[PDB]
Structures are given as C-alpha cells and as structure tokens.
Design a protein around this ligand. Structure first.
Ligand SMILES: CCCCC/C=C\C/C=C\CCCCCCCC(=O)O
Ligand SMILES: CCCCC/C=C\C/C=C\CCCCCCCC(=O)O
Ligand SMILES: *[C@@H]1O[C@H](CO)[C@@H](O)[C@H](O)[C@H]1NC(C)=O
Ligand SMILES: *[C@@H]1O[C@H](CO)[C@@H](O)[C@H](O)[C@H]1NC(C)=O
Ligand SMILES: *[C@@H]1O[C@H](CO)[C@@H](O)[C@H](O)[C@H]1NC(C)=O
Ligand SMILES: *[C@@H]1O[C@H](CO)[C@@H](O)[C@H](O)[C@H]1NC(C)=O
Ligand SMILES: *[C@@H]1O[C@H](CO)[C@@H](O)[C@H](O)[C@H]1NC(C)=O
Ligand SMILES: *[C@@H]1O[C@H](CO)[C@@H](O)[C@H](O)[C@H]1NC(C)=O
Ligand SMILES: *[C@@H]1O[C@H](CO)[C@@H](O)[C@H](O)[C@H]1NC(C)=O
Ligand SMILES: *[C@@H]1O[C@H](CO)[C@@H](O)[C@H](O)[C@H]1NC(C)=O
Ligand SMILES: *[C@@H]1O[C@H](CO)[C@@H](O)[C@H](O)[C@H]1NC(C)=O
Ligand SMILES: *[C@@H]1O[C@H](CO)[C@@H](O)[C@H](O)[C@H]1NC(C)=O
Ligand SMILES: *[C@@H]1O[C@H](CO)[C@@H](O)[C@H](O)[C@H]1NC(C)=O
Lengths: 50, 299, 278, 49
C-alpha cells in the first residue's frame, strides 16, 4: 500500500501549477509566444523535478 | 547517449521509453463563414461618452483583421492574456466590444492596475484581464471649429468604481458637510463635466477613440474563430491536432461518454485534456498519448 | 397607478435550516470519477434561512419585503399555481439609479435594466372569470420608463394559471453579481411535500450570464394575486406560495463527481470537526 | 522610413502590416532599436510619395 500510494501521489502531483498560468504545457504553448512561454515552462519543469 | 560515454559494460541498461512519430496533422474549426462586422464597431459615425460606455456582444464571426490594414492606423494596441502573434490560431468564446471617447493623454489609464479620473470614476478594468486595448487618433471626425462639446466625463464620486461597472446618476455632488438639497451652491458641484475639442488643440487634447475587447479563450464552446482552414478528421493514428486552438498530439478514438450542453472538453486526474467534442460534428472523441511501454537494451 | 394593499396580518416570520442545498457547478469543464476541491462563494450547510409565505385565511399575508442582498443570495421557491413571477434588484429603487427587472408577464420573460420608478407594493393581478379562464390583468409593478440601456424579451409561450393539494415544483435559483456580470443558476426538481422545505441534495447548472454592469445592494420579489368577486382591498386572495432565502459566504467544499459527470455529494470544510478532517 | 505611429511595431513578438509583410524581427533578438522624427527632411508641400 505504501508503494502504491507513493506512485499514486506522484501521478497526482501533475495537476498543480507551480505559479504558472496553467498546469498543462499545451495550453501555455497555444496561448503564448515562445520567448514569453519559456518562463512558465521553466517554472513547471523546476516544480516537477523537485 | 544516455550514459554519456563511448564505452558500455555488461548490464540491462533500461533506456528511454519508446515513442511514435505523429507524421500527420489536422485542423478542426466550426462552420463560420461570414466575416465579423468590423465596419459597424470601428467605422461608427458616433461614439458614446466615456462615462456611459456602450457594450456590444459579438458572435458568429470570422475574426480576420487583415481587412483593417488599409483602413485605420492604431496608435496603441496592447494585448494582455494572449500573445498578439498567436491571435490567428485560436477560437474565442464570449468576446465583447466596448467603445468610448477620451482625451489624447488619458489613453494610458485604460489598463489594469492604473489610477486617475478615468480609472476611478468612468471606466475601470479588472486586475485579471484577458483581451486587447485598441485606440487610434480621431481628430478629423470628432472635432469642430466651434468646439465639440458632445462628450462628457465624471469628475466627482463618493467612492471608486468596481471593475466593468457603469454609473449614469446625475445627482448633485456635495463637497462639504452642509447638505446641498439639489441647489448648486458653493460646495455643490455638477458631477459630470464637459470636454472641449478643437482642431487646433495640442496632440494631448485631441479626441481619441478607444475599443476594448474582452474574451475567454479555452473554457466553454466558442463562436468567434480566426482564419484557419478545416481539414478532414483522422482517427486511430498520431496527429498534431488543433481543436479550436488547443494544440497537442495523440490518437483519437470513439468515446462512450456524453457531454452536457454547456461543456466542450473534459480533464482527467492529471488535469490534461483527454476527451474533446468536435465542433463540426457534435461528437465525443478521446485523446491518448502515442508513447506507452518501456524498452531496455541488453548488451 | 399601483396602489398599496391594505388589511394584512402582522407577525414575525419563522426560520428554517437548508440541509444540503445551494451547491452549483463552479465552471464549464467536464469531469468524472474525481474528488475536486475548490473554493468559491457557497451557501453554508445548516445556515439560518428566513421563511416567507403567501396564503389566504385572519392569517392572510403576502410578505414581499426589501431583503438585503449580500454578495450573492440563494433563492428557492416552491408552489403549484405559478404565484412567483420574478424579482427586482437595485440600490434604492427610486429612479435615481438603475435597477434590474426580471419578470414573465404571462407569455414571455422580460429582462430590462433601466431607471425604473417602483412603488411600495409591486404585484401582478389575475382575474378569474366565472362564466368561462384567468386573464392575468393589472401589470403595475413600476411607474415610469427611462433610458433602458439593456433589453431582452424571450419568444412568446403559454402556461397554466390555476394548478390547484401539495406543492410540486421546488424551483431553486442562485444569484451572484461579480465583476459586472450577473450569473444565474437554476434547477427544477419535482416534489410532493406538503408545507415545508424538502431536505436533500441538488446540483445547480448555469443558466445565463448577463453583462448588466450595475451595483446591487437590495432586492424584492414579485407576487401574483388573483381576485374574482371578493368585495386596495378587493379580495386579493393568494392560493399557495412560499419561498426561502439564504446568504452566500466564502467557504471551501469537497465536490464529488459521478461516473456520468454529475455532482452527487458535497462536504463542507468548516461545518464541524468531522467534516474538517474529511 | 515608416509612419509616425508604426514605430511600436518594430519589436519582437509584435503584429501588424509592418511586422508581417515588410520587416520582421526574430523572437530572440539582441540589439537596440532607434527612431526619431524626420518631418523636416522627408516631407514636401506637394506630398512626398
Ligand atoms: C506635492 C506632492 C507631495 C508628495 C505627496 C506624496 C505622495 C502622493 C503621490 C502622488 C500624488 C501626485 C500625483 C497624482 C497623479 C494623478 C493622476 C491624474 O490626475 O491623471
Ligand atoms: C470587431 C472585433 C470583434 C472581436 C474579434 C476577436 C479577435 C480578433 C482580435 C483583434 C482584432 C482587432 C485588432 C486588429 C489589430 C491590427 C493592427 C494594425 O492594423 O496595426
Ligand atoms: C459543417 O461543415 C461540414 C463541411 O462543410 C459539413 O460536413 C457539416 O455537416 C457542417 N455542419 C453542420 C451542422 O451543418
Ligand atoms: C470607413 O471610415 C472611413 C474614414 O473614417 C470612411 O471614409 C469610409 O466611408 C468608411 N466606410 C464605411 C463602410 O463606413
Ligand atoms: C487602400 O487604400 C487606398 C487609399 O488611398 C485606396 O486608394 C486603395 O484603393 C485601397 N485598396 C484596397 C485594396 O482597399
Ligand atoms: C453601491 O451602492 C451602495 C448603496 O447602498 C453604495 O453604498 C456603494 O458605495 C455602491 N458601490 C460603489 C462601488 O460605490
Ligand atoms: C404607498 O405608501 C407610500 C408611503 O407610505 C406613499 O408614498 C404612496 O403614495 C402610497 N401609495 C399610493 C398609491 O398612495
Ligand atoms: C438563527 O436561527 C435560530 C434558530 O431558529 C434562532 O434562534 C436565531 O435567532 C437565528 N438568528 C438570526 C440572526 O436570525
Ligand atoms: C435545522 O433543521 C433541520 C431540519 O428541521 C434539523 O435536522 C437540524 O437539526 C436543525 N439545525 C439546528 C442547528 O437547529
Ligand atoms: C408582457 O410583455 C410583452 C412584451 O414584452 C407583451 O407583448 C405582453 O402583452 C405582456 N403581457 C400582457 C399580459 O399583456
Ligand atoms: C371569458 O369571458 C370574459 C367575459 O365575457 C371575457 O372578457 C374573456 O375574454 C373570456 N375569456 C375566454 C378565454 O374566453
Ligand atoms: C438618460 O436620459 C436622460 C433624459 O431623461 C438624459 O438626460 C441622460 O443623458 C440619459 N443618459 C444616458 C446614459 O442615456
Ligand atoms: C448514470 O450512469 C449509470 C451507469 O450505467 C446509467 O445507468 C445512467 O443512465 C446514468 N445517468 C443518466 C442520466 O444517463
């Protein structure tokens, strides 16, 4: 149960935006130009790496 | 490459998960043909005063502004929630158009998080704003030799204005503690003052026409879409789809679930769009990633 | 033209608790088989709710006062004779400012924003002709017209007017006025309870979002009275009607989404310690 | 040489006729943009075309 819960919560962590405008990459890329969207992409990358 | 070396010893060496290349791409937009009435809103003979701004709903449009490049030149065009370059590959949901007339140097107050008489007593924008603010000089049409006095603005109020609010009350403003009782006395003032426009005024006093557009981008079904041609739907293979501006990559398939009338697409626990409703055909489709399964190299 | 009605009995109203009412969809995104936690304006569970009623006899009364409007209210009306017609919203309702009027005459719902001049007792009349048929005369809610910036009238329809032993409609509404918009949520659940509020769970779906752009602090309700031959005091008898008013507060809820994609259960995070740990 | 109010379009990530059909700057740009009025030199009574 501990292993299953750890994997489940790791999957669930993907639904939180680490200060970005949205929690998914597709919406950010569709709404913003590359040079501006790179900031939000970096924020999400850092959060998921942590 | 994974090991970052030119020598590999024995082992199992679980490498990166395999992927599938999405060799094709589709675009799917609703059935909208008639162009948007740019002439009605931009080329209007008359414009309302700033305090009593006029709000107009826009729907069933093809938001192609390429026809405007020869008509009008805009001195200010600032977009907040969406990049100006990506304004052609999107579908908008609930656009609205607001228009009024202000002075030459008060255009800077039409922006979120700003102060001034315009941003306090006449027209306030929300802190969280998505849309664009367009203004252009109109000294040729809104000025006369004898002075144009058709436009009025508010000068006094008891408090600030909440976002997207209107107030056309003309009650006498009381500046002191003595009651006014309707009489325009010493401390009593008319709340709204008049503008003075002349053809020979300075550039900071020439009239400026302002058009503000507010919309929601992804949520809810959309009605105003840009100039992108729709292609035939492709099923059961990887494609760089584009469903009303939502660009991704996946494999489409039939879905048993049915959406409510006011819903467009759904999200899973990961908050990603797994199911969408096609705009051309009222159908439900499911999106799944093209990569699934691990691969390891024994050597 | 409107005249204040006389001969109404005086008594303070009663109080009731809405068990699990006032839950509505937060947005327009489909979800299923998930436990979504969201925070917004909501009606707290087991909150005090005033109970008004319109009934005939010395107990004849109408009870359509100027209730305050505090950052969104919860309205639930139950009846069987379509007595409840609509509401009016505004600050002072004395033609100095703008006010929103929502009402269906008998054949089409009318929504207007204008500088209306209301009176103290707004109502709509219904006439019961005995030879043959209820005509619904006497449209005297307000007294004057003005600029009337906003305007919307639906397509004509028809509806029954008598419908008279237990209530059968239980029509609920939710009003919110945020950032210049007037969101409305509605639901229609048939019932058969006699003279109370049926406890249960109901999820409300959005109906309309009007860009009214005005300031609202107070509101009323329009009632329809029917008189045929009973003698200001011309026998304005009311058949049967009651409605309940609650006030929204900023709370946190734990909505549950069904397999189909519907909200079936909610949990308050501030009701009691057990719900807090839930 | 451009119109007076079109100097705003000379910037990365901008739209308009100048930034679509005439002259476009890259998204990753390093440098400076300089503009100044030239009405005394580039205008004539009969119209400069
Ligand atoms: C004489 C000022 C002494 C210093 C006072 C200190 C702080 C107050 C700050 C700003 C007030 C002056 C600027 C007013 C801007 C109004 C803008 C407008 O009208 O469009
Ligand atoms: C009447 C518009 C209704 C809303 C349409 C929705 C989205 C389209 C967005 C913007 C179009 C108007 C601005 C055009 C800018 C051109 C700039 C230039 O020429 O320098
Ligand atoms: C939309 O257009 C497509 C192609 O022109 C057509 O097949 C489809 O039936 C149209 N939808 C409706 C609702 O008419
Ligand atoms: C558009 O505006 C220009 C100048 O404002 C005017 O000359 C032209 O007639 C207008 N066209 C329409 C269709 O209104
Ligand atoms: C563009 O505007 C100019 C104004 O001088 C006019 O002569 C020309 O015909 C216009 N062309 C189009 C395609 O609108
Ligand atoms: C709305 O109206 C009330 C009157 O009850 C007033 O006190 C309040 O200041 C108004 N709102 C604003 C933002 O002025
Ligand atoms: C109703 O009462 C108010 C205040 O008591 C009064 O001003 C008004 O005139 C009355 N209605 C009529 C029709 O007289
Ligand atoms: C709330 O309801 C209770 C029970 O009916 C009552 O005793 C109390 O006075 C009510 N409070 C208010 C403020 O109405
Ligand atoms: C509110 O009323 C309901 C139904 O009558 C009851 O179950 C509940 O205990 C009441 N709550 C309070 C605090 O009186
Ligand atoms: C209600 O208003 C509509 C127009 O909004 C009108 O046609 C209708 O006749 C009115 N109702 C009655 C009973 O007259
Ligand atoms: C019923 O009779 C009255 C009186 O003759 C008449 O005014 C009314 O229009 C009639 N209504 C119907 C539905 O026949
Ligand atoms: C509303 O109408 C009055 C005349 O009754 C007029 O003086 C006022 O300017 C009008 N205001 C608006 C916003 O239409
Ligand atoms: C809800 O899901 C069940 C599961 O099969 C289904 O039988 C039922 O019809 C669904 N509800 C509606 C309103 O279709």
């Amino acid at each position: 149960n501990q292993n299953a819960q750890a994997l489940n919560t790791l999957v669930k962590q993907l639904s939180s935006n680490f200060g970005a405008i949205s929690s998914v990459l597709n919406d950010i890329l569709s709404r913003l130009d590359p040079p501006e969207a790179e900031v939000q992409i970096d924020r999400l990358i850092t959060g998921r790496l942590q | 490459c994974t090991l970052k070396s030119f020598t590999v010893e024995k082992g199992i060496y679980q490498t990166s998960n395999f992927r599938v290349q999405p060799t094709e791409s589709i675009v799917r937009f609703p059935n909208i043909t008639n162009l948007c009435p740019f002439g009605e809103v931009f080329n209007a003979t008359t414009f309302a005063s700033v305090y009593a701004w006029n709000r107009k709903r826009i729907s069933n449009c093809v938001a192609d502004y390429s026809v405007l490049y020869n008509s009008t030149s805009f001195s200010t065009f600032k977009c907040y929630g969406v990049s100006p370059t990506k304004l052609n590959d999107l579908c908008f949901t609930n656009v609205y158009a607001d228009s009024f007339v202000v002075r030459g140097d008060e255009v800077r107050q039409i922006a979120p998080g700003q102060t001034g008489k315009i941003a306090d007593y006449n027209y306030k924008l929300p802190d969280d704003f998505t849309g664009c603010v367009i203004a252009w000089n109109s000294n040729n049409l809104d000025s006369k030799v004898g002075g144009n006095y058709n436009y009025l603005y508010r000068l006094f109020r008891k408090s600030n204005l909440k976002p997207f609010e209107r107030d056309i009350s003309t009650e006498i403003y009381q500046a002191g503690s003595t009651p006014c009782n309707g009489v325009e006395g010493f401390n009593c003032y008319f709340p709204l003052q008049s503008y003075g426009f002349h053809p020979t005024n300075g550039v900071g006093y020439q009239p400026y026409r302002v058009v503000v557009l507010s919309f929601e981008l992804l949520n809810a079904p959309a009605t105003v879409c840009g100039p992108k041609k729709s292609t035939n739907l492709i099923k059961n293979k990887c494609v760089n789809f584009n469903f009303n501006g939502l660009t991704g990559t996946g494999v489409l398939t039939e879905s048993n679930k049915k959406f409510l009338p006011f819903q467009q697409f759904g999200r899973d626990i990961a908050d990603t769009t797994d199911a969408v409703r096609d705009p051309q055909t009222l159908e439900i489709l499911d999106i799944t990633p093209c990569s699934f399964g691990g691969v390891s190299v024994i050597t | 033209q409107c005249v204040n009605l006389t001969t109404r009995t005086q008594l303070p109203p009663a109080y009731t608790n809405s068990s699990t009412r006032g839950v509505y969809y937060p947005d327009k995104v489909f979800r299923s088989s998930v436990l979504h936690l969201t925070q917004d304006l909501f009606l707290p569970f087991f909150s005090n709710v005033t109970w008004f009623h319109a009934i005939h006899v010395g107990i004849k009364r109408f009870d359509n006062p100027v209730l305050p409007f505090n950052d969104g209210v919860y309205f639930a009306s139950t009846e069987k004779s379509n007595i409840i017609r609509g509401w009016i919203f505004g600050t002072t309702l004395d033609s100095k400012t703008q006010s929103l009027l929502i009402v269906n005459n008998a054949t089409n719902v009318v929504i207007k924003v204008c500088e209306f001049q209301f009176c103290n007792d707004p109502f709509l009349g219904v006439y019961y002709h005995r030879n043959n048929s209820w005509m619904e005369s006497e449209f005297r809610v307000y007294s004057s017209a003005n600029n009337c910036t906003f305007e919307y009238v639906s397509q004509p329809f028809l509806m029954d007017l008598e419908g008279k032993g237990n209530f059968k409609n239980l029509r609920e509404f939710v009003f919110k006025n945020i950032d210049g918009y007037f969101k409305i949520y509605s639901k229609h659940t048939p019932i058969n309870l006699v003279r109370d509020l049926p406890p249960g769970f109901s999820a409300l779906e959005p109906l309309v979002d009007l860009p009214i752009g005005i300031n609202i602090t107070r509101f009323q309700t329009l009632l329809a009275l029917h008189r045929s031959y009973l003698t200001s005091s011309s026998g304005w008898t009311a058949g049967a009607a009651a409605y309940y008013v609650g006030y929204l507060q900023p709370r946190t809820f734990l909505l549950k989404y069904n397999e189909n994609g519907t909200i079936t259960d909610a949990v308050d995070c501030s009701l009691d310690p057990l719900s807090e740990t839930k």
